[PDB]
Amino acid sequence: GSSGSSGEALDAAAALSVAECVERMAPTLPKSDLNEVKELLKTNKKLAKMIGHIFEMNDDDPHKEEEIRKYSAIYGRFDSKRKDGKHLTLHELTVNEAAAQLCVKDNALLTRRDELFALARQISREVTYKYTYRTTSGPSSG
C-alpha cells in the first residue's frame, strides 16, 4: 500500500500568492453555520463518513489538515500507480492547494464543490497572470 510520494508541485514564490490571496478573501468571505451542518451529518451517512469526522473534530489538530489536504482534490489524485502521470501539469497543481487552503478556514466549503471549484480557479488564474518581479524602485541593470 503505497511507498514513496511525489516531490513538490508549486514553487516557494507561487505558493505565497495562494496563501496571501486565500487569507485576503477569508476576511471578506462570510462564515458557515457549523451548528446547521452538524445536524445534517447525523441525518446523512455518506457525508458523515466522507468529511463528517472533520466537522466534529477540533481546529488545532494536525490530523485535520491531513484529512482536508487529502480530501481537497479536484484534479490531482492521492495514489501513484502504473507508469502513468497525466493529471497535473501546472494549473491543476495550483487549483489543488488553492482550494485546500480555503477548505481550512471554511470547513463547509468541503461540501460545496461548485463554489470551491470557482474560488480555486480565481486564484489559479491570478498566479498564472503575473510571474516574478520586473523592476524595483526604478530601472534594473544587470
Where do the structural domains in the chain lie, given as residue ranges?
A: 1-142
Q: Report the structure determination method.
A: NMR
Q: In a 10 Å sphere around its CB, with 0-12 CB exposed, 13-18 middle and 19+ buried, how is residue 77 labelled?
A: exposed
The three grid cell numbers given for residue 129, joined into one nine-digit string: 497572470
Q: Write the DSSP symbol of residue 52.
A: T
CA-CA distance, 76 to 95, in Å (whole number)? 9
| Nearest-10 Cα torsion for 70, 71, 72, 73 | 90
The three grid cell numbers given for residue 123, joined into one nine-digit string: 486564484
CA-CA distance, 56 to 58, in Å (whole number)? 7
Angle, CA of 129, 130 and 134, to the nearest 5°? 155
User: What homologous superfamily does CATH list for 1-142?
Assistant: NAB conserved domain 2 (1.20.120.2010)
